[PDB]
Design an enzyme around this catalytic site. Structure first.
Site, PDB file in Angstrom:
ATOM      1  N   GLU A 144       1.725   3.383   3.139  1.00  0.00           N
ATOM      2  CA  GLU A 144       2.185   2.700   4.349  1.00  0.00           C
ATOM      3  C   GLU A 144       3.718   2.629   4.333  1.00  0.00           C
ATOM      4  O   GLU A 144       4.316   1.634   3.935  1.00  0.00           O
ATOM      5  CB  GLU A 144       1.516   1.318   4.457  1.00  0.00           C
ATOM      6  CG  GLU A 144       0.026   1.459   4.825  1.00  0.00           C
ATOM      7  CD  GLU A 144      -0.865   0.247   4.533  1.00  0.00           C
ATOM      8  OE1 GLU A 144      -2.037   0.494   4.180  1.00  0.00           O
ATOM      9  OE2 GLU A 144      -0.435  -0.927   4.678  1.00  0.00           O
ATOM     10  N   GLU A 165       1.806  -5.576  11.177  1.00  0.00           N
ATOM     11  CA  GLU A 165       1.078  -4.313  11.152  1.00  0.00           C
ATOM     12  C   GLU A 165       1.715  -3.249  12.041  1.00  0.00           C
ATOM     13  O   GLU A 165       1.582  -3.297  13.261  1.00  0.00           O
ATOM     14  CB  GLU A 165      -0.369  -4.551  11.569  1.00  0.00           C
ATOM     15  CG  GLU A 165      -1.159  -5.377  10.594  1.00  0.00           C
ATOM     16  CD  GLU A 165      -2.010  -4.532   9.677  1.00  0.00           C
ATOM     17  OE1 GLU A 165      -2.953  -5.102   9.090  1.00  0.00           O
ATOM     18  OE2 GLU A 165      -1.738  -3.313   9.545  1.00  0.00           O
ATOM     19  N   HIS A 194       2.450  -3.776   6.868  1.00  0.00           N
ATOM     20  CA  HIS A 194       1.331  -2.873   6.638  1.00  0.00           C
ATOM     21  C   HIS A 194       1.228  -1.900   7.811  1.00  0.00           C
ATOM     22  O   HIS A 194       2.037  -1.965   8.745  1.00  0.00           O
ATOM     23  CB  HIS A 194       0.017  -3.645   6.490  1.00  0.00           C
ATOM     24  CG  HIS A 194      -0.150  -4.318   5.168  1.00  0.00           C
ATOM     25  ND1 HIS A 194      -0.763  -3.704   4.092  1.00  0.00           N
ATOM     26  CD2 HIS A 194       0.190  -5.555   4.743  1.00  0.00           C
ATOM     27  CE1 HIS A 194      -0.779  -4.531   3.068  1.00  0.00           C
ATOM     28  NE2 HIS A 194      -0.205  -5.667   3.436  1.00  0.00           N
ATOM     29  N   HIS A 204       0.832  -1.190   0.000  1.00  0.00           N
ATOM     30  CA  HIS A 204       0.000   0.000   0.000  1.00  0.00           C
ATOM     31  C   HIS A 204       0.878   1.257   0.000  1.00  0.00           C
ATOM     32  O   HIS A 204       1.663   1.468   0.929  1.00  0.00           O
ATOM     33  CB  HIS A 204      -0.945  -0.017   1.208  1.00  0.00           C
ATOM     34  CG  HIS A 204      -2.127  -0.920   1.037  1.00  0.00           C
ATOM     35  ND1 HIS A 204      -2.843  -1.426   2.100  1.00  0.00           N
ATOM     36  CD2 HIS A 204      -2.717  -1.408  -0.085  1.00  0.00           C
ATOM     37  CE1 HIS A 204      -3.828  -2.180   1.643  1.00  0.00           C
ATOM     38  NE2 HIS A 204      -3.778  -2.177   0.321  1.00  0.00           N
TER      39      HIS A 204
HETATM   40  C1  LIG Z   1      -7.322  -3.930   5.698  1.00  0.00           C
HETATM   41 AS1  LIG Z   1      -5.867  -4.821   4.797  1.00  0.00          AS
HETATM   42  C2  LIG Z   1      -6.010  -6.733   5.082  1.00  0.00           C
HETATM   43  O1  LIG Z   1      -5.964  -4.471   3.182  1.00  0.00           O
HETATM   44  O2  LIG Z   1      -4.320  -4.279   5.444  1.00  0.00           O
HETATM   45 ZN   LIG Z   2      -3.205  -1.931   4.957  1.00  0.00          ZN
END
Ligand SMILES: C[As](C)(=O)[O-]
Ligand SMILES: [Zn+2]
Ligand SMILES: C[As](C)(=O)[O-]
Ligand SMILES: [Zn+2]
Lengths: 234, 237
Positions: free
Chosen positions: A52, A207, A157, A49
């Site tokens: 991120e 995360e 992430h 992403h």
């Molecule tokens: C909310 As997600 C599994 O795209 O990091």
């Molecule tokens: Zn994410």
């Protein structure tokens, strides 16, 4: 000789980088083959992403901190380099790449996501791709994993503050200790973890919490660098 | 009739993206020309250094939030798209792009930045280019600013938590107030070949707005108001 390169030398990567493809807009897809490569070598990756980035910078710094011969695991700093320079979540086609993998649960349609932590409701819309694994970025990563066959993947992430390891494992709790994040024991349609699930590829989503690149590169530097160095202490 | 696009559709960019070149590794250099550019039109810049992420997401959010008609100023989200992808401060050549501008004060050899706010000194070595304005990212931006002739430039960085306005002007005091950052004239150290150094020699007004240390998640909350208003900023009248 030393565990770590002097700070004065950490502006640049150790030579060794390879390309594994090209982004939608033509930026190279980059990966760092582990020098101490073997069948135990896992794959550590970030920036699926584009927004991120605390985990992208921290892993870059770790790469540039740990003396090369100690690194056991393959690294991709940024899966989504277009989304990354555009400071946005999706790639350049509007696709949430983490809904685009050719998993068995890749539904075609739209996805939605949260504006920030203070966002309450996942309303901000993205797409999932035309066909499964439609995007250039998705294939390249998939093809890269099939060629190298990592023993495991750790996918960074943010901003949920935790380690998600559905296996409950030695890694998933090494990760909890060293990042001081709670451990937690894939159904997310078309996501990376579902696609790994199909293959019994061990996949831990790491995360990060909401954190500046400036704090993380200090706070999480050592945990990251030890991650590149990791081995079941047996 | 709204000041902002609905939160549900801020996932894409409003139309009118352009390219002003290519990075060293082949990525496009992307910019967002102001809808109806006028003599007042200025330039808003980000991602000069590839690890200074929290402003490139903030500006990308503001650009994707504010209603397009109301934008007064041109936008470059990422000066150094090879930097951002590599989580690195320099471009793909180990060059500090903010020591690479063909300003008069450009000096060959090495430059040193601070590892992070924790580190007690600046000792991490980077290159300044093998010639003034050597890097493709640098040249491309330099030609862009000649083509468009902006009224001024605001360039966002990390993480010195202040507004550096060498002129101490209105926009500088607006920025200080709108982002709740102190207004200062300089980072108390020398930066040969810096973008601002190049700007001063063209008599172009450059302001560096340094974010504090802050995540892209809270900056997309805390500073989105200010960033959005900066895209439509005009003097007092
Ligand atoms: C909310 As997600 C599994 O795209 O990091
Ligand atoms: Zn994410
Ligand atoms: C060293 As500077 C003024 O580009 O933050
Ligand atoms: Zn800076």
């Amino acid at each position: 000789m030393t565990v770590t390169r002097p700070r004065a030398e950490r502006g640049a990567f150790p030579p060794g980088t390879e390309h594994y493809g090209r982004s939608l807009l033509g930026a190279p897809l980059i990966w760092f083959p582990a020098p101490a490569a073997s069948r135990e070598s896992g794959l550590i990756l970030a920036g699926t992403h584009g927004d991120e980035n605390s985990s992208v910078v921290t892993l870059s710094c770790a790469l540039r901190t740990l003396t090369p011969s100690l690194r056991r695991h393959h690294v991709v700093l940024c899966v989504n380099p277009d989304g990354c320079q555009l400071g946005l979540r999706a790639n350049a086609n509007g696709v949430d790449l983490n809904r685009n993998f050719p998993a068995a649960n890749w539904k075609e349609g739209e996805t939605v996501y949260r504006w920030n932590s203070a966002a309450e409701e996942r309303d901000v819309v993205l797409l999932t791709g035309d066909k499964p694994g439609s995007e250039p970025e998705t294939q390249a990563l998939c093809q890269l994993i099939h060629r190298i066959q990592p023993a495991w993947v750790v996918s960074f992430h943010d901003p949920l503050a935790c380690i998600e390891d559905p296996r409950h494992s030695e890694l998933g709790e090494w990760l909890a200790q060293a990042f001081e994040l709670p451990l937690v024991t894939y159904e997310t349609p078309g996501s990376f973890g579902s696609w790994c699930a199909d293959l019994n590829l061990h996949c831990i989503t790491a995360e990060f919490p909401p954190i500046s690149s400036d704090e993380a590169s200090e706070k999480y530097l050592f945990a990251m660098a030890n991650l590149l160095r990791w081995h079941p202490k047996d």
